Nucleic acid binder design. Structure first.
Ligand SMILES: [Mg+2]
Ligand SMILES: [Mg+2]
Ligand SMILES: [Mg+2]
Ligand SMILES: [Mg+2]
Ligand SMILES: [Mg+2]
Ligand SMILES: [Mg+2]
Ligand SMILES: [Mg+2]
Ligand SMILES: [Mg+2]
Ligand SMILES: [Mg+2]
Ligand SMILES: [Mg+2]
Ligand SMILES: [Mg+2]
Ligand SMILES: [Mg+2]
Ligand SMILES: [Mg+2]
Ligand SMILES: [Mg+2]
Ligand SMILES: [Mg+2]
Ligand SMILES: [Mg+2]
Ligand SMILES: [Mg+2]
Ligand SMILES: [Mg+2]
Ligand SMILES: [Mg+2]
Ligand SMILES: [Mg+2]
Ligand SMILES: [Mg+2]
Ligand SMILES: [Mg+2]
Ligand SMILES: [Mg+2]
Ligand SMILES: [Mg+2]
Ligand SMILES: [Mg+2]
Lengths: 206, 51, 203, 185
RNA sequence: CGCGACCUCAGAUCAGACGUGGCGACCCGCUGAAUUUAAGCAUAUUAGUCAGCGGAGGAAAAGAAACUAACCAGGAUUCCCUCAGUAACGGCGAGUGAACAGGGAAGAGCCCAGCGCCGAAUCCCCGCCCCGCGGCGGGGCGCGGGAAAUGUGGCGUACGG
RNA sequence: UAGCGGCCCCCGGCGCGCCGGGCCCGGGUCUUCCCGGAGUCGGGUUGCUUGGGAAUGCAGCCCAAAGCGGGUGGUAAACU
RNA sequence: CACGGUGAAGAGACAUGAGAGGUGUAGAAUAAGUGGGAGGCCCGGGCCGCCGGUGAAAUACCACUACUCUGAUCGUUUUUUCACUGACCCGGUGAGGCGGGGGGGCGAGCCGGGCUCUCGCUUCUGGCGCCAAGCGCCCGGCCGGCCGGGCGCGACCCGCUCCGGGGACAGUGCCAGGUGGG
């Protein structure tokens, strides 16, 4: 997409903030719409947008990790949970789905994605849980802030998505850099070029 | 034919539009250039329409 | 200047303004005779591109020519020979209709030299060409040092020997590997030089 | 159906605007060969012992000093022999903001300068006495052409039949109208 | 209505010029066969030849790359030697058939339009005087007439300006 | 006939000199601007032509341009 | 295919864009799937839920699109019909009264008057018919008289094709198939 009309859209919603003055927490989003790709057919695109600002104020995160993910996690204030604690979660598929539905997206260590398909593989992708691996550097400080808001553009049984980006309190040029990342990643991820779109509503939430 | 080609590109029959432009102007390179500048002027009209 | 605007606007012949003007003017020139004096160039920038200067001595003669190929003028379509020469209908003239316009204008006004010519309109039955002619004995042309190649007797009837632009385009002349058959000055010169036998004295 | 780029030359200045413009133009006429030869003599008898403002004539001069922004008013004749000499020129003047008017008579417009015909003239500057006069001309002219150009650009000419065919249609359609009045009685 | 511009188009035994026609060995533009060969013949060949038509000059045409090349690159055109009876075309038959590079003969380059700036600075013609006057030209004077702003001249052209 | 043999005319070409008029002109360095020929190229088709072979050139007809573009780079075509 | 246009309907293509129905239940119903969400709306309080409850995806909050249907007006093109004329064509003429608008004589129905249509002055005979009478308004020459001109009605005005007849079809240009002992 071009950037001039996207500038016009972000100016009209930066001055459409005064139309709303939000209190259900200040965050906006955008939509993406596609025209003639069959929702039941192949060439399904499935990718992750790395985003650098995370303009979503309360991103809900937890970690699922082994030893040496204890003390640094307690000092960064993210709750830590062990393999026998996942056995405690596995003692019923009652509470674990509710905690994973209250939380948005997880991340987990190397050897616990080995144990997440015990009997709970199809239980956990029922709520869309593929926990993302850490590394051997063992520094999750702001790397979790980077892994969050990596928006999954995924094709499923109908032809549209919506992406959670933005608050007008942040700076405009970085916000349009975020929407630029989203739109050029999806235009590259599509089977054809930017002709496949209908429009873009980078609007307020409410 | 230029009006008919932007009318094809509005409905986003881009492959048939390029074939029709090839049948009109001749060489495929000139056809690609013609379709690109028709996409440019049609994008100019669309970016004029929102303001 | 205005001439680049005029030139780029003559380039957009399928536009509405040009289609209207070509239709209206083509009707006008179809209403007149096949060879008539034009008081000024219809295409001023095109004329001055081809060599016109708005001064005394340059005249414009506008020509109507009939379109199509050259039907072979044999009685009842019978060319009495081998079937490779039985063609009557779909044959073509080796020179262009523009050069036909120049030679008609020159052979009428034989006291004038054909400089160049250009296209001004057509329909299905006629092509219309404006030919620039020059009077080599007018004193403006006779006393301008920049224009007196035409005063010399070697430039009598350039349009009949193909020395004009539309005349030289039909001869196959040019530089390079596409024009090996006109090395010399012509197809004539190349054929003569290649189909000769150099019998030397001492061999 | 005349295209609007040609049809815009059929809409002109009226008599009052034309006479007020010509009255201004009669004072900025370029000097003839006589009052240039004697102007040479008058310069020589004082320098051998600034140029006042003039009208710029012709499509090339006027086109060049319109795209240079240097024009302040431009008058274009309605009736040039190929109209393509000037059919671009209202569009050019509108984009570069130059006040343009279309005047009847290239014969009059080339009687301004001392010739037979001229396509267009242009006021580049005027004296301080006539600056208010050019202001009143420009404020009259710009309300007809430069501000109305987006309406002018889509207004097509011609498409009006013969009076005999218009009369035949009028009789037929009034018969249909009176019969439609007879429908309800 | 009438007068005057302009445009377009007429008329004149108006003033001054120019073309026609001939020759045609050589040259340029078209048009263009068949005999012949293929042991027949139709594509091919003859042949872009003869015949036909138009236009010249003491030469014509061509000519300063919308080129050759693929190199350590050359450098308008024309002509000679070689390329070469070769690449290639061909009922792949009969037959046809170049080009570049190389060595020479010659050797020369340049100009517009366009883009721009300079009070159209430009051109033609008639009157008078002086000169020269058998290639009608030079200087000056004309409140002499036209052309030309629908673009003349000066600078300037791809090697850049 | 031979001869850098003679004589007399004529027509040039070649030098210097005078009058009038014209022309009152450049190279380098840096900065700022500007730059191009369209029913033409090109495509299809037809016919002729060429050694030019999926088309060498020309022409008719139809389509019909662009400007970091176009043409060529001897096998049609796409990407670079 | 081109020259080759104008308008109005019929038949399509359903593009800009308006409205709209979703059942293996579970659960606030009837969640078409998905991104994300800790505190709107209504004006400190109130409202289901995000959570409980819990099924094949858990629904607050705002979202995009869809699947299909329907209407709307500019889908914009294509196609058929009906018309138009300005290209083109044909005919007639010494391109002689074409088309409207008047104004006038009749008729039709109403109260001297408005409106629709119509007509425009030649048929009793093998004559003749032009080159204006008449009326009105001006102008001139000789002392109201004579002589001698001009304009306007008579012979209405306005126009954009001479008048008709066809017409985007004949036709012509270039290709394509058929036919073709001419
Ligand atoms: Mg030939
Ligand atoms: Mg020569
Ligand atoms: Mg060519
Ligand atoms: Mg005479
Ligand atoms: Mg034989
Ligand atoms: Mg034999
Ligand atoms: Mg035989
Ligand atoms: Mg041959
Ligand atoms: Mg001959
Ligand atoms: Mg001759
Ligand atoms: Mg001679
Ligand atoms: Mg030459
Ligand atoms: Mg060479
Ligand atoms: Mg050999
Ligand atoms: Mg041969
Ligand atoms: Mg060589
Ligand atoms: Mg100039
Ligand atoms: Mg010059
Ligand atoms: Mg050059
Ligand atoms: Mg002797
Ligand atoms: Mg051949
Ligand atoms: Mg290549
Ligand atoms: Mg190749
Ligand atoms: Mg037969
Ligand atoms: Mg026979």
């Amino acid at each position: 997409v071009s950037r001039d009309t996207l500038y016009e859209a972000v100016r009209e919603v930066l001055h459409g903030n005064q139309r709303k003055r939000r209190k259900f927490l200040e965050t906006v989003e955008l939509q993406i719409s596609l025209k003639n790709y069959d929702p039941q057919k192949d060439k399904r695109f499935s990718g992750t947008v790395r985003l650098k600002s995370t303009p979503r104020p309360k991103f809900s995160v937890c970690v699922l990790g082994d030893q040496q993910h204890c003390d640094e996690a307690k000092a960064v204030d993210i709750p830590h949970m062990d393999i026998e604690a996942l056995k405690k979660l596995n003692k019923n598929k009652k509470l674990v789905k509710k905690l994973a539905k209250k939380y948005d997206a997880f991340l987990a260590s190397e050897s616990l994605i080995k144990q997440i398909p015990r009997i709970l593989g199809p239980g956990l992708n029922k709520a869309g849980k593929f926990p993302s691996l850490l590394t051997h550097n063992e520094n999750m400080v702001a790397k979790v802030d980077e892994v969050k808001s990596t928006i999954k553009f995924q094709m499923k049984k109908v032809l549209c998505l919506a992406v959670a980006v933005g608050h007008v309190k942040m700076t405009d040029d970085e916000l349009v850099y975020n929407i630029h990342l989203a739109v050029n990643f999806l235009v590259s991820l599509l089977k054809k070029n930017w002709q496949n779109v209908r429009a873009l509503y980078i609007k307020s939430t409410m | 034919y230029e009006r008919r080609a932007m009318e094809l590109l509005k409905v986003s029959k881009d492959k048939r539009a390029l074939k029709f432009i090839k049948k009109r102007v001749g060489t495929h390179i000139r056809a690609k250039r013609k379709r690109e500048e028709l996409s440019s002027v049609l994008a100019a009209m669309r970016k004029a329409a929102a303001k | 200047g205005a001439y680049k605007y005029i030139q780029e606007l003559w380039r957009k012949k399928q536009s509405d303004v040009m289609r209207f003007l070509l239709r209206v003017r083509c009707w006008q020139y179809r209403q007149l005779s096949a060879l008539h004096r034009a008081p000024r160039p219809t295409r001023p920038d095109k004329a001055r591109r081809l060599g016109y200067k708005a001064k005394q001595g340059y005249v414009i003669y506008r020509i109507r020519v009939r379109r199509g190929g050259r039907k072979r003028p044999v009685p009842k379509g019978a060319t009495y020979g081998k079937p490779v020469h039985h063609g009557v209908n779909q044959l073509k003239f080796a020179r262009s209709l523009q050069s036909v316009a120049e030679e008609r204008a020159g052979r009428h006004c034989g006291a004038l030299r054909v400089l160049n010519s250009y296209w001004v309109g057509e329909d299905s039955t006629y092509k219309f060409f404006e030919v620039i002619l020059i009077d080599p004995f007018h004193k403006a042309i006779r006393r301008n040092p920049d224009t007196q190649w035409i005063t010399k007797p070697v430039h009598k009837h350039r349009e009949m020997r193909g020395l004009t632009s539309a005349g030289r385009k039909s001869r196959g002349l040019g530089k390079g590997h596409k024009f090996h058959h006109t090395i010399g000055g012509s197809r004539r010169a190349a054929w003569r030089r290649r189909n000769t036998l150099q019998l030397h004295r001492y061999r | 159906k005349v295209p609007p780029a040609i049809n815009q030359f059929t809409q002109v200045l009226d008599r009052q605007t034309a006479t007020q413009l010509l009255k201004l133009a009669h004072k900025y006429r370029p000097e003839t060969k006589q009052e240039k030869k004697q102007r040479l003599l008058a310069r020589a008898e004082k320098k051998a012992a600034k140029r006042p403002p003039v009208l710029r004539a012709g499509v090339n001069t006027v086109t060049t000093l319109v795209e240079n922004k240097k024009a302040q008013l431009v008058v274009i004749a309605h009736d040039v022999d190929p109209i393509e000499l000037v059919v671009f020129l209202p569009a050019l003047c509108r984009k570069m903001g130059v006040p343009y008017c279309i005047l009847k008579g290239k014969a009059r417009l080339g009687r301004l300068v001392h010739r037979k015909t001229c396509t267009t003239v242009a006021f580049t500057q005027v004296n301080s006495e006539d600056k208010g006069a050019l202001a009143k001309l420009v404020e009259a002219i710009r309300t007809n052409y430069n501000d109305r150009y987006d309406e002018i650009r889509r207004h097509w000419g011609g498409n009006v039949l013969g009076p005999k065919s218009v009369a035949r249609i009028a009789k037929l359609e009034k018969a249909k109208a009176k019969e439609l009045a007879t429908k309800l009685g």
